[PDB]
RNA sequence: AUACGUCCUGAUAGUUAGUAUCCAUCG
RNA sequence: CGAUGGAUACUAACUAUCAGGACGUAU
């Protein structure tokens, strides 16, 4: 419901001061907080951008969330928003087109990479950004593009101070032990320079969502050795499904279930088996249906058929599942997060959870009456899996226990954040574009592809490798970077001595990058020359 | 018989680097 | 094709603990 609540407006007031990250539970409509905040600061956007007004930018990982968020933003606000995705091909635009877009629009939504491209090629300054929103921020580890955005936070001046919002459901994306939960949290908070908050009053969540969490039922298959032609786990799965339908015999009403699988072929064949067995005229089998949502885009450049699970096809199958046409869904770990599904009360984890975050998200999925979180585990690993579950549960407990009086800011830990190894190529300083050390490879590939020639798939640049040792005889590396022969330059160049292979690659790319600009092969914005091929 | 210092082998855990496999994402 | 993230198996080095073997000193 689109109604403000006391226990959420208190968090709104808490976040009004500085940048804040919320750790509200799943299914709580956390986007309500974001829309409320975007409503609160609506009085600063009227400023025109010919003279220096401010707009808002939104960050989203993947395509399906784009329209989902845009719909809510457009529905519950009078603002004239725009939608931008990489599929349309906006990179072909020029400065004036982008400026017209800025003048026309009020609120802009896009994926992660587009902001990298706009900033780095100098199409706009970090100024004039009233706000920024970070959903599923816990991806900002190592070299995710969020970190490359936030690099410009400190290198540039602090003349603009955009407030930072924080939405997440899990705060660590790798396995951990209970004694090591504070280190990663402190590091992440330092990177984003914010404070993580938590829920206070789950007055309505504890009634129909928190209390309706799936109680764990663990069942051991006994694979110690026409259904006789398949593995015993299949027969046990049929038996346990029949046990579940022992409940649905009286409750023959509509319901939907999720069967998470790992291997693609497993998902492929379970649908065929289910459809074949649905013809036994059984009362349970009288309503049995199956369909694929697995694989997603998979390898975009063919390399497999798999029906390819086309984006249009995915939209079709998701729509037909949401409406209630089908009941049983066979999936890989693609629907676990970032999409709305009709309520379910039966999850068959045909394969075990991998790490902490995956287990949390999988357990959170079921929401209907008497949800049953089910795990099929061999009897011989039952104790190991039980102690792993104990470890996960204590990690969750200490996580929910540490988030009290979290009013301490990182402060100097943000300054302590490390840097790269070489200065970026900045021909005109802050008045010119930038080329970071860790982004030259993609730009070189892009220029080579856009370089007028036959688009051979083998056109990837040629590199040579050599292993040496320094004076102290540590491991050392070096590479040489080839550029296309059709280009005015042909001879390859060698970079600086880096201690790892990929570091040497990136350094070589950076060193060669400025070379093509300085001789006039790059525009004023370091982009590939936009002169038409007719000329 | 004990303690301290040096060399070697095995077990425990962590860091670093190499190889292979599997899943997911966008460009 | 590129760029990212997660997990498993093998290998190598470093570190710390323990065990065992060898040498020297003290009791």
CA A188/CA A180 separation, integer angstroms: 14
**CA A205 / C1′ B25 distance in Å:** 31
Q: Residues of CATH 3.40.50.300 domain(s) within chain A?
A: 6-198+406-415, 206-372
CA A458/CA A249 separation, integer angstroms: 60
Q: Determine the topology of domain A6-198+406-415 in CATH.
A: Rossmann fold (3.40.50)
CA A223/CA A221 separation, integer angstroms: 6
> How crowded is residue A270: how many other Cβ atoms within 10 Å of its Cβ?
19
Q: Determine the topology of domain A429-518 in CATH.
A: Double Stranded RNA Binding Domain (3.30.160)
- Give yes or no for CB of A520 within 7 Å of strand B: no
Specify the nucleotide whose C1' lies closest to residue A442 (CA).
Answer: C2
Q: Closest Cα to residue A365, out of A406, A337, A403, A398?
A: A337
Task: Produce one character per residue of A33-65: b if its CB has 16 or more CB atoms within 10 Å, e if not.
Answer: bbbbbbeeeeeebeeeeeeebbbbbbbbbeebb
- Give yes or no for CB of A295 within 7 Å of strand B: yes
Q: Determine the topology of domain A206-372 in CATH.
A: Rossmann fold (3.40.50)
- Give yes or no for CB of A298 within 7 Å of strand B: yes
**CA A262 / C1′ B22 distance in Å:** 9
Task: Produce one character per residue of A478-505: b if its CB has 16 or more CB atoms within 10 Å, e if not.
Answer: bbbbebbeeeeeeebebbeebeeeebbb
**CA A292 / C1′ B24 distance in Å:** 16
> How crowded is residue A9: how many other Cβ atoms within 10 Å of its Cβ?
12
- Give yes or no for CB of A174 within 7 Å of strand C: yes
Outline where A278-310 has alpha helix (H).
Answer: none
Sign of the torsion formed by the C-alpha atoms of A94, A97, A100 and A105: negative
Mark residues 252-271 of chain A whose C-beta is closer than 7 A to nucleic acid strand B.
262-264
Pairing of strands A475-481, A493-494: antiparallel
**CA A143 / C1′ C4 distance in Å:** 7
Specify the nucleotide whose C1' lies closest to residue A354 (CA).
Answer: C7
DSSP A528: B
Name the helix (H) or strand (E) containing A290: none
Sign of the torsion formed by the C-alpha atoms of A476, A471, A440 and A535: negative
**CA A535 / C1′ C20 distance in Å:** 81
Asked if residues A69 and A85 have their Cβ atoms less than 8 Å apart, the reply is no
**CA A460 / C1′ C1 distance in Å:** 8
Specify the nucleotide whose C1' lies closest to residue A475 (CA).
Answer: B17
- Give yes or no for CB of A475 within 7 Å of strand C: no
CA A245/CA A193 separation, integer angstroms: 51
What are the beta bridge partners of residue A164? A132
Which positions in strand C are less than 7 Å from the protein's CB atoms?
1-8
Asked if residues A294 and A309 have their Cβ atoms less than 8 Å apart, the reply is yes
Q: What is the resolution of this structure in A?
A: 3.4
Q: Residues of CATH 3.30.160.20 domain(s) within chain A?
A: 429-518
């Amino acid at each position: 419901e689109f109604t403000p609540r006391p226990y959420q407006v208190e968090l709104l007031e808490r976040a009004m001061k500085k940048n804040t990250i919320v750790c509200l539970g799943t299914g709580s409509g956390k986007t309500f907080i974001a829309v409320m905040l975007i409503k609160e600061l609506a009085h600063e956007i009227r400023g025109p951008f010919n003279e220096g007004g401010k707009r808002t930018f939104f960050l989203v990982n993947t395509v399906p969330l784009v329209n989902q968020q845009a719909k809510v933003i457009r529905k519950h606000t009078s603002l004239k928003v725009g939608e931008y995705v990489g599929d349309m091909g906006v990179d072909s635009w020029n400065k004036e087109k982008w400026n017209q877009e800025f003048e026309k629009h009020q609120v802009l939504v896009m994926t992660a990479q587009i902001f990298l491209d706009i900033l780095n090629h100098g199409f706009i300054s970090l100024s004039q950004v009233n706000l920024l929103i970070f959903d599923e921020c816990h991806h900002a580890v190592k070299n995710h593009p969020y970190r490359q955005i936030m690099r410009h936070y400190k290198n540039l001046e602090q003349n603009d101070r955009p407030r930072i919002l924080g939405l997440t459901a899990s705060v660590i994306n790798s396995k951990c032990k209970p004694n090591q939960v504070e280190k990663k949290i402190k590091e992440l908070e330092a990177t984003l320079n914010s404070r993580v908050v938590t829920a206070s009053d789950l007055e309505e969540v504890a009634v129909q969502k928190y209390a309706t969490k799936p109680k764990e039922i663990i069942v051991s298959y006994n694979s110690d050795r026409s259904v006789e032609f398949v593995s015993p786990k299949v027969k046990k799965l049929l038996e346990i499904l029949k046990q579940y339908f022992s409940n649905n015999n009286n409750s023959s009403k509509e319901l939907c279930g999720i069967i998470f699988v790992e291997r693609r072929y497993t998902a492929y064949v379970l649908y065929k088996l289910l459809n074949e067995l649905s013809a036994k005229r059984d009362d349970d089998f009288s309503f049995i249906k199956c369909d694929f949502v697995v694989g997603h885009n998979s390898s975009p450049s063919s390399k497999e058929k798999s029906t390819e699970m086309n984006s249009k096809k995915q939209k079709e199958v998701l729509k037909k599942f949401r409406k209630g046409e089908c009941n049983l869904l066979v999936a890989t770990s693609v629907v676990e997060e970032g999409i709305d599904i009709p309520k379910c009360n039966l999850v068959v984890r045909f394969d075990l959870p991998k790490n902490f975050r995956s287990y949390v998200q999988s357990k959170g999925r079921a929401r209907a009456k008497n949800s049953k979180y089910i795990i099929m585990v061999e009897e011989d690993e039952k104790n190991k899996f039980q102690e792993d579950l104990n470890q996960y549960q204590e990690i969750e407990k200490i996580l929910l226990r540490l988030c009290h009086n979290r009013d301490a800011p990182s402060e100097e830990d943000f300054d302590s954040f490390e840097d790269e190894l070489l200065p970026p190529y900045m021909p005109y300083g802050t008045d010119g574009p930038r080329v970071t050390m860790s982004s030259a490879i993609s730009l070189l590939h892009r220029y080579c592809s856009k370089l007028p020639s036959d688009r051979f798939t083998t056109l990837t640049p040629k590199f040579t490798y050599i292993e040496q040792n320094n004076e102290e005889e540590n491991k050392m590396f070096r590479c040489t970077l080839r550029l296309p022969i059709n280009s005015p330059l042909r001879e390859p160049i060698t970079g600086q001595p880096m201690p790892s292979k990929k570091l040497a690659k990136r350094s070589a790319a950076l060193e060669a990058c400025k070379k093509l600009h300085e001789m006039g092969e790059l525009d004023d914005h370091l982009l590939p020359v936009k002169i038409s091929r007719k000329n």
